[PDB]
Design a binder for this molecule. Sequence first.
Ligand SMILES: CC(C)[C@H](N)C(=O)O
Ligand SMILES: CC(C)[C@H](N)C(=O)O
Lengths: 90, 90
Amino acid sequence: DNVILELTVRNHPGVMTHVCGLFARRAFNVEGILCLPIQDSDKSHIWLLVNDDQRLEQMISQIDKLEDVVKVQRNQSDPTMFNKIAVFFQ
Amino acid sequence: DNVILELTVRNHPGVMTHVCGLFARRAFNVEGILCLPIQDSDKSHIWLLVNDDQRLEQMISQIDKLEDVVKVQRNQSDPTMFNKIAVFFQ
Ligand SMILES: CC(C)[C@H](N)C(=O)O
Ligand SMILES: CC(C)[C@H](N)C(=O)O
């Protein structure tokens, strides 16, 4: 159903616009997002919750090509992490 | 120091690109992001952690104008919410 993408990116302006822009240009909806800075660095962590799609693998390719994306992978996180976060903020 | 912006937006493709694009186009960095869909609706809640700035007023003005942004407000969330989230996901 859904899948979680984990990105390590540079914490500088415009990075999230590039990443989400790849989905926007494909009418691909992003269901959940978490972005947290990494202490003592110039980078941030991004979690993207998206519907599992045949187009996903070619998109991971496009994300990795972005200069400000250091790494992009799948399903390393708690698959229900956004449900647990929502319990405390919704 | 920093402030948290709360947005209610439609859960449609491209919406996060529009919101962050406003910051990107002004070289305004977004430090933390949380996006959660709202149960039983076509809307999502976005929390944006950004440096408190006089530029924010105009920025908030532009965010509210976006058709897909239903509402946008300041200082209604726990200012340290992204520190608390990091305790459990970093
Ligand atoms: C990491 C990301 C959210 C970046 N800080 C940006 O403003 O686009
Ligand atoms: C709410 C937001 C993340 C929207 N679903 C988007 O894909 O841009």
